[PDB]
Amino acid sequence: MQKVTGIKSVDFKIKALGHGVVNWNGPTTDNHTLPKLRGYTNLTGKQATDINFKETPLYISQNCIRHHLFRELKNVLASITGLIRGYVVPSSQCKRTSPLLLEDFVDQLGNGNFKTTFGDTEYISYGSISIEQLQFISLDKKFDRAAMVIKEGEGEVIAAELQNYIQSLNPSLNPQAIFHSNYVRRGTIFEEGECGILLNDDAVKALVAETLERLANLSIRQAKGYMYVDDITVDYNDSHKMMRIKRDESEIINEQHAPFAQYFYAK
Amino acid sequence: MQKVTGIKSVDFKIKALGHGVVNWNGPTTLTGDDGKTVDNHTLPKLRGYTNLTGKVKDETGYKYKKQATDINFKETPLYISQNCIRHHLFREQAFDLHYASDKNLKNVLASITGLIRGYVVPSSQCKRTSPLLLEDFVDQLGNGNFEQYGQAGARDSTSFFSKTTFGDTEYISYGSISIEQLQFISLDKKFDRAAMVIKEGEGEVIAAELQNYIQSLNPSLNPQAIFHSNYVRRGTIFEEGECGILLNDDAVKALVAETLERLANLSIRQAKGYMYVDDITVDYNDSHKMMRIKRDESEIINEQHAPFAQYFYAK
Amino acid sequence: MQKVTGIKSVDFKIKALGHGVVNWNGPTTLTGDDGKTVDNHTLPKLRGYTNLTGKVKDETGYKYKKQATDINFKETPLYISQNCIRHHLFREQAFDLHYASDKNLKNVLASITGLIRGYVVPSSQCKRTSPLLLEDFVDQLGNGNFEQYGQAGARDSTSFFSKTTFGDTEYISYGSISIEQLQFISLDKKFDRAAMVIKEGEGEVIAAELQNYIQSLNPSLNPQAIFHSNYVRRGTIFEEGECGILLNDDAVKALVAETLERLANLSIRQAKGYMYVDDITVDYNDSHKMMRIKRDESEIINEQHAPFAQYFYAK
Amino acid sequence: MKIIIEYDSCWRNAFLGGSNNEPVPKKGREFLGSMTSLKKEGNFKVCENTLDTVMGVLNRLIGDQRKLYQARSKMYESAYYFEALEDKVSFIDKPQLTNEISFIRNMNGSTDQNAFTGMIKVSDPVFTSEYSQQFWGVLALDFTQLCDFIIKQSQVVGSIELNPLSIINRLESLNQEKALENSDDLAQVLKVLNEYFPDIEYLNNKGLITPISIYCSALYLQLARLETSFNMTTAKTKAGGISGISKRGFTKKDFMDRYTTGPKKTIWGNPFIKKEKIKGQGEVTSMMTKASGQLEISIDVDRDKAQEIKILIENAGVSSFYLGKKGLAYVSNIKL
Amino acid sequence: NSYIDIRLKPDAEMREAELSSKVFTKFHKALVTLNSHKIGISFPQMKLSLGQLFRIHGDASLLHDLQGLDWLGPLAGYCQVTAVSAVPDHVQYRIVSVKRSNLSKAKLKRLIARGSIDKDGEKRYKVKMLGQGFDNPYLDLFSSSTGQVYRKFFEFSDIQAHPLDGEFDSYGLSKTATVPWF
RNA sequence: CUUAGAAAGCAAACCUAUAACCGUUCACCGCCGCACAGGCGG
DNA sequence: CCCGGCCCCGTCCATTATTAT
DNA sequence: GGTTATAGGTTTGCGGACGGGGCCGGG
């Protein structure tokens, strides 16, 4: 009961480098396709040649970043696509929310020119991994958070496979995927729960490390442009502050001191 | 029947920060670029926005829809619905209210959900009004844009779609806590303000549990929840009243402080975007003005001693 | 006499400010995007609004309902019902009139509800007309929009809904206080305007109680409540009158000041939104034109220059 | 002659029966503003500016303190000033109509069908007594045990929760039970019931039989039977009868009020709304109409007469009146 | 000396790309079973995309072995197949060289694991790797053994008038062996 | 003195989860080697 | 002191269902 | 070239007539 303690979320700062435009918005007006630029509008109360790249900088969509990041049913649920990235299936209403949150990658370099192309680009970005959404997988249609329609044996088998996959990530650790018929989130005034799977500290850390690893080696190849991630700074956040790393970088903690926070309990 | 003095309401100004759109309005019919109508574009909640160009066909009845690319974020700024903010504030007990019943009402009534947030049960027609009031959270930065999206199959109906997205966002908002609605709990169906239908002895028990919760908020303070068979509102000429529970200054202080605390640490992770509240300015208003802090006052003074206003009296 | 002189009525213009819709019309039948009518959209009170487009096939007899997204806030502006405004003004006494009875009515007549709000006695012929007249509060800003709403956790009949919401609102309204209706209280059943059923001698004691209340309003002033058996109106060609109580200049001044004070301090917190009266412009009207303030605002007089008009003869 | 009278926010409906054209009753005018009333044809009233309204305004402007019907009848005066001119006056209304639902008060003080006030008494003797269990235990039996109980059967083994809410909810469940056809068993229990309770027959007004009636009458039967075993004086009222429960059925307000501390629930009012189903329109909703606009009332007379009227109004000194109900209406202009 | 044509039948379920990939991998498994270093292929209609026709070259009996073995069994319907026949007398020739870079993420990870490269060396490695690009036609191949989906690239010589005998390694593309082009 | 008169549509609710604007979703995972040399396997 | 009208409280009531290119 | 799939499309309540008894007034 009481209060939740431990690491709330794993934040990070990404600094990447590249050349040319990785992600284009499309052709908009004589006309030009363009690239995604934050805050830009072509409408006057306009010519392509008038732009200030300092005011409306080039950026890469979180969608694109995610797409190249993951580059990828029971198999879906056990995939990294299932656990880290989220998903939706139009038939029925089965979904899972991505614990991974990513800001835009914003180019600090102001080199444009008349397609509208780009020279050397330096992207800066921030991000977070939510332990609450990561550690729990809702298999029940009660709250409509249901990942899948399952059988009691399918319940146990699913837990097992995920345990196996997450194990295949980091052999040194010993992850646990625990299925239960009732999982209640901390803080409810009633005891009401959903059938689902909770992941142990080793599993959660393994997944976080896998995600961060993919982020650090992340690279995108576009016809006339490319991006590679240069530096990555990681913060394990036990505080109530969101993007602590963004507002104040003196309070950042690089190595994990505390065990991950447990947001749910079987009942 | 004398006039009421002391703190009438607790107002505040909220400054929040975030990235991307936390709260979306939905898909909206707009005209594609030179391709006439487009049935898929996702729009965030924009204040004062309409998809209509106010130009019509007369007999046809068609109304000319705006271009997706045409929006003025200064005239029609991005905002987060009070509904969403309230949802994420109380987000831990969110699903509990659906399961409510009489004893279940007993449990709901003592809680942050019962006392501060309001509630309704349709079956037994039991309800409570929320003393917490919030304006829109309005983005002052106004960095939006048309953003194109696609699927990797690149063939079918999922295909290509689009959204109007946002960069760095800075929200400003205002709000108030009503002492009148917060301090009193009506247990009687007489005025249709009833929280829960109660028996003769159960009133004091309910009051006791309330007292326990409010105490559990701030051990330093000394809250009291006092039940009575007749509670009369200030200003009636016939002095007619209902059975209920009144909260003393300390209890009210505990709930107000709890609310402001939840507001100050409030953070939302939603729709691939996030928000955190940066700053909060609070004013305890004993004068007759609503949102004095909003109107120009450099001179406001909150004293530790000044007591909360008492709107009801036992009889 | 031959003429009526002095202040005939006190007109005023109210400027109010607020956020969100304080006063809602209700759920309204509208057509969904699929063509089928969707029976859930909540609409605020809009001036001149109709959900009907007309244009139907004769054999149907149907009306072809409008889309929720189609509204013109310049043509159909948001407003607060005069009913609502008055309700929140007198809200302290709101339920008291139900308990009104002929014997207990003594208490009703001396009060803010009796003198200003007016009243009704159930299963009785006793009444008093309100000297306070108020228009609707009409929004000059007009920032509305279609706002989508939903419930978390389930997809059900309740799960998905919508409202037309509003941002910051600025209301303008007009109103008047009738000295004729205010200064005289009819105790006679003759014209069926009777306030109270009276036995002989009761006039002076009732007058005394009125005197007490009105004095208690403003101790500084010196009010007079005079009962008499026959009261005839001045400028009238009519020779017939009623037994009643007339209030002198000071009493009328007290009542007017009380009303203006309540209006100036008027505030409404309803439906997750709020309203406060920001500014009020007042005119004491001695002229031969009604609502002078509405047409020409240059002829307005803010402070009372002359005595209030005396509409009646002692016998 | 012309009088231009501009008005804003005026109520276009009327909630009362009788007439304002005639002396108000000692008990006042019958109020039908209730949704139950508004459902009935003729109770929903839409009003517009008429000659009566206009003449009432004119008489208001000349300062008449009498009601219109008293002025027309020359009640307390010699002559009616407008008697000659009333046929000579017409008007042109330019309203802007708004459809809004408004909450209107109900003064008749009607007790709510389903509601109660105050606190519930679980300490009431009828629940806590010895006879209580096998008394209230009748209602918890199924239809067959009840039918057998109706004839001579003294056996009730039912052990149930004793609460006013439990009982009233049990009655709620028993009343929603579907009607039953008349058969052998129903014939025998009908004959027995009609033997013990002749004055009422168990049938619908139209061709039906209901379980709740049989249940209630079985409770009455149990009341009559147990009177020999124990004292039923606590279980019955002054001039005895079961509170809130008739022989043909039950009523929630009376039962609750009987077992609750405090008075019955008063109905403070209701929105003004009528939801009707019309063929081809489907569902149609009717709200209160609020009109705002200008009214040109034309009186045809000599310019001298017009000036007489004008100085009469000026001598009256009337200002700021409502129009027809609850409005703000002033006189914008006067043309001779 | 003998060749066979396979024309892709485009489908709503599988567009030309996916079909091309799957039939290519099936052909690969076919050659793996048949164990022949002599069976080749070309892409006649290729014009910046391998195209909708895959032509298999080799011995008539081996092509008969392919038709009979029905390697591409499930996908036969999307495919339209001509009979085996001798190539036309007037024909040009070209090899098929699979173009693969010497740089990869796995190789970089390997160099880090071997302690062979510096922090700055990683950056220069990445810039050289992502700096280069292949305008050449490619195909994304699903796998089993490695359990990966990898992009293979194709390049060809220009209109060599004379044949050069050589090996066709695995997937049928030939490095140093010129297939008939017509 | 008009449609007698007085008359809250009130209380509660996340538009929510997923998706490169682009050359065909996908430049992958390993092996030889000092190699940011050149290649190999699927 | 007797009769009738009026007022207040207990008792017992309950009818309905339609629409879209 | 495609130009959104997927469900959810409001939930609750919103009286009064009729009969008997008691009290008050008139004869």
Which one-letter amino acid corresponds to residue B90? F
Tally Cβ neighbours within 10 Å of residue B153.
11
The CA distance from E38 to E42, in Å, is: 14
Contact E130 A227 (CB under 8 A): yes
CA-to-CA dists, residue C225 to C110, C200, C212, C250, E93, angstroms: 12, 17, 9, 10, 122
Asked which of D239, D267, D295 is the last residue of a domain, the reply is D267
CB C93 within 8 A of CB C107: no
- The enclosing H or E element of B121 equals strand B119-121
The bases of strand H with some atom under 7 A from any protein CB are 1-16, 21
Indicate the DSSP class of residue D250: B
Residue partners of C105: CB distance under 8 A and separation at least 6: C121, C126, C195, C196
Which one-letter amino acid corresponds to residue D14? A
The CA distance from B262 to C179, in Å, is: 52
Sign, CA torsion A228/A231/A237/A239:
negative
The CA distance from C188 to C126, in Å, is: 10
Indicate the DSSP class of residue E63: H
Tally Cβ neighbours within 10 Å of residue A92.
10
Asked which of D246, D267, D288 is the last residue of a domain, the reply is D267
Contact C135 D280 (CB under 8 A): no
Domain total in chain D? 2
Phi then psi for residue B216, to 5 deg, are: -65, -20
C156 part of contact set with chain A, CB < 8 Å: no
DSSP states along chain A: -----SB-EEEEEEEEEEES-S-----B---B----BTT--------TT---TTTS-BEE-HHHHHHHHH---HHHHHSHHHHTS-EEETTTTEEE--SEEE--EEE----EE---EE-EEEEEEEEEEEHHHHHEEE--TTTT--S----HHHHHHHHHHHHHHHHHH-TTS---EEEEEEEEETT-SS---EEEEEE-HHHHHHHHHHHHHHHHS-EEEETTEEEEEEEEEEEEE-SS-SSHHHH-SSS---S--SPBP--EEE-
By CB atoms closer than 10 A (0-12, 13-18, 19+), residue C272 is buried
The CB-side HSE value for C100 (13 A sphere, CA atoms) comes to 33
**How far is it between the farthest Cα atoms of chain D?**
96
Contact B95 A128 (CB under 8 A): no
Assign residue A2 a region (left: φ > 0; alpha: ψ between -120 and 50; beta: otherwise).
Answer: left
Measured between beta carbons, the chain C residues lying within 8 angstroms of B49 are: 145
Residue partners of A197: CB distance under 8 A and separation at least 6: A136, A137, A139, A158, A159, A162, A177, A178, A179, A180
Q: Which two tokens stand for residue D21?
A: 């054209």
The CA distance from D24 to D26, in Å, is: 7
Q: Which two tokens stand for residue E15?
A: 């567009």
D125 part of contact set with chain B, CB < 8 Å: no
> Are D232 and D194 found together in one domain?
yes
Residue nearest F42, CA–C1′ metric: E146
The CA distance from D256 to D261, in Å, is: 9
DSSP states along C133-177: EE--EEESS--EEEEEEE-SS--STTTEEEEEEE-EEEEEEEEEE
Distance of CA C43 to the CA centre of its chain: 23
CB B198 within 8 A of CB B206: yes
Asked which of D267, D301, D328 is the last residue of a domain, the reply is D267
C49 part of contact set with chain D, CB < 8 Å: yes
Helix (H, G, I), strand (E, B) or coil at E16: helix
What is the gyration radius of the CA atoms in chain B, in angstroms? 24
Structural domain harbouring D10? 1-108+268-336
Q: Which of C290, C298, C299, C277 is nearest to C10 (CA)?
A: C290
Q: Which two tokens stand for residue E129?
A: 């790797």
> Are D313 and D210 found together in one domain?
no
The partner residue sitting opposite B243, judged by closest CB among D118, D121, D268, is D118
CA-to-CA dists, residue D25 to A226, C127, D29, E104, angstroms: 91, 13, 6, 100
The CA distance from D164 to D186, in Å, is: 30
Tokens 């939706």 sit at which residue? A88
Sign, CA torsion C198/C199/C200/C202:
negative
Q: Which two tokens stand for residue D186?
A: 């129903």
The CA distance from B57 to A213, in Å, is: 57
Report the Cα–Cα distance between both ends of chain D, in Å, rounded. Answer: 5
Which residues on chain E place their C-beta less than 8 Å from a C-beta of chain A?
A: 105, 123, 126-127, 130-131, 133
The partner residue sitting opposite C92, judged by closest CB among B63, B94, B234, is B234
The CA distance from A129 to A256, in Å, is: 14
> Are D189 and D218 found together in one domain?
yes
Indicate the DSSP class of residue B309: P
The CA distance from D88 to D90, in Å, is: 7
Lateral strand order in the sheet of A177-185:
A136-138, A194-199, A177-185, A264-266
Residues 38-77 of D with CB under 8 A from C: 62-67, 70, 76-77
A92 part of contact set with chain C, CB < 8 Å: no
Assign residue B7 a region (left: φ > 0; alpha: ψ between -120 and 50; beta: otherwise).
Answer: beta
Phi then psi for residue E20, to 5 deg, are: -55, -50
Helix (H, G, I), strand (E, B) or coil at B122: coil
Residue partners of C175: CB distance under 8 A and separation at least 6: C11, C12, C14, C132, C133, C134, C135, C263, D328
Min distance C183 CA to chain D CA atoms (Å)? 13
Tally Cβ neighbours within 10 Å of residue D231.
11
Q: Which of B285, B309, B127, B129 is nearest to B235 (CA)?
A: B309
> Are D164 and D260 found together in one domain?
yes
The partner residue sitting opposite E105, judged by closest CB among A19, A217, A226, is A217
Helix (H, G, I), strand (E, B) or coil at D298: strand
CB A87 within 8 A of CB A100: no
B147 part of contact set with chain C, CB < 8 Å: no
Q: Which two tokens stand for residue C105?
A: 């009515």
Q: Which of C63, C8, C24, C1 is nearest to C306 (CA)?
A: C8
Resolution (A): 3.2
Which one-letter amino acid corresponds to residue B39? D
Tally Cβ neighbours within 10 Å of residue B100.
24
Going through D80-142 in order, the beta strands assigned E by DSSP cover 89-100, 103-105, 119-120
Going through D79-135 in order, the beta strands assigned E by DSSP cover 89-100, 103-105, 119-120
B157 part of contact set with chain A, CB < 8 Å: no
CB B222 within 8 A of CB B149: no
The CA distance from C177 to C256, in Å, is: 8
Residue nearest H12, CA–C1′ metric: B122
CB of C98 nearer than 7 A to strand G: no
Chains in contact with B, where contact means 3 or more Cβ–Cβ distances below 8 Å, are A, C, D
> Are D122 and D238 found together in one domain?
yes
Q: What's the topology of domain E1-182?
A: Alpha-Beta Plaits (3.30.70)
In this complex, how many residue pairs, one in chain A and one in chain B, have their CB atoms less than 8 Å apart?
A: 81
Q: What angle do CA E126, E127, E129 make, to 5 degrees?
A: 60
DSSP states along B226-283: EEEEEEEETT-SS--EEEEEEE-HHHHHHHHHHHHHHHHT-EEEETTEEEEEEEEEEE
The partner residue sitting opposite B136, judged by closest CB among C149, C167, C275, is C167
Helix (H, G, I), strand (E, B) or coil at B21: coil
List for chain E the helix, strand, coil content (%; round to 5). Answer: 30, 25, 45
Which one-letter amino acid corresponds to residue C302? N
The partner residue sitting opposite D265, judged by closest CB among B189, B199, B200, is B189
CB B191 within 8 A of CB C95: yes
In this complex, how many residue pairs, one in chain C and one in chain D, have their CB atoms less than 8 Å apart?
A: 157
DSSP states along B125-146: TEEE--SEEE--EEESS--EEE
Domain boundaries, chain E: 1-182
Helices (H), chain E: 16-34, 60-69, 105-113, 119-131
Q: Which two tokens stand for residue C196?
A: 């109270």
DSSP states along chain C: -----SB-EEEEEEEEEEES-SSEEEE--EE-TTSSEE---EEE-BTT--SB-----TTT----BPPTT---TTTS-BEE-HHHHHHHHSTTSTTGGGG--TTTHHHHHSSHIIIII-EE-TTS--EE--SEEE--EEESS--EEEEEEE-SS--STTTEEEEEEE-EEEEEEEEEEEHHHHHEEE--STTS--SS---TTHHHHHHHHHHHHHHHH-TTS---EEEEEEEEESS-S----EEEEEE-HHHHHHHHHHHHHHHHT-EEEETTEEEEEEEEEEEEE-SSSTTHHHH-SSS---S--SPBP--EE--
Residues 198-237 of C with CB under 8 A from D: 233-237
Contact D117 B188 (CB under 8 A): yes
The CA distance from B78 to B140, in Å, is: 9
The CA distance from C210 to C204, in Å, is: 10
The CB-side HSE value for B50 (13 A sphere, CA atoms) comes to 21
By CB atoms closer than 10 A (0-12, 13-18, 19+), residue C64 is middle
Residue of chain B whose alpha carbon sits nearest to that of A105: B167
Helix (H, G, I), strand (E, B) or coil at D70: helix
The CA distance from A110 to A108, in Å, is: 6
The CA distance from B68 to B30, in Å, is: 6
The CA distance from A149 to A74, in Å, is: 10
Residue partners of E50: CB distance under 8 A and separation at least 6: E20, E43, E137, E139, E154
DSSP states along A74-112: HHHHHSHHHHTS-EEETTTTEEE--SEEE--EEE----E
Is E28 annotated as catalytic? yes
CA-to-CA dists, residue B249 to B163, B186, B254, D262, angstroms: 49, 18, 9, 30
Contact C174 D65 (CB under 8 A): no
B276 part of contact set with chain A, CB < 8 Å: yes
Q: Which of D3, D5, D2 is nearest to D291 (CA)?
A: D5
Measured between beta carbons, the chain E residues lying within 8 angstroms of A219 are: 105, 126, 130
CB B206 within 8 A of CB B188: no
CA-to-CA dists, residue C305 to C8, C284, C295, C300, angstroms: 13, 8, 21, 12
The CB-side HSE value for D298 (13 A sphere, CA atoms) comes to 5
B63 part of contact set with chain C, CB < 8 Å: yes
The CA distance from A108 to A120, in Å, is: 10
Phi then psi for residue E168, to 5 deg, are: -110, 110
CB C296 within 8 A of CB B160: no
CA-to-CA dists, residue A40 to A27, B164, D194, E27, angstroms: 13, 11, 87, 50
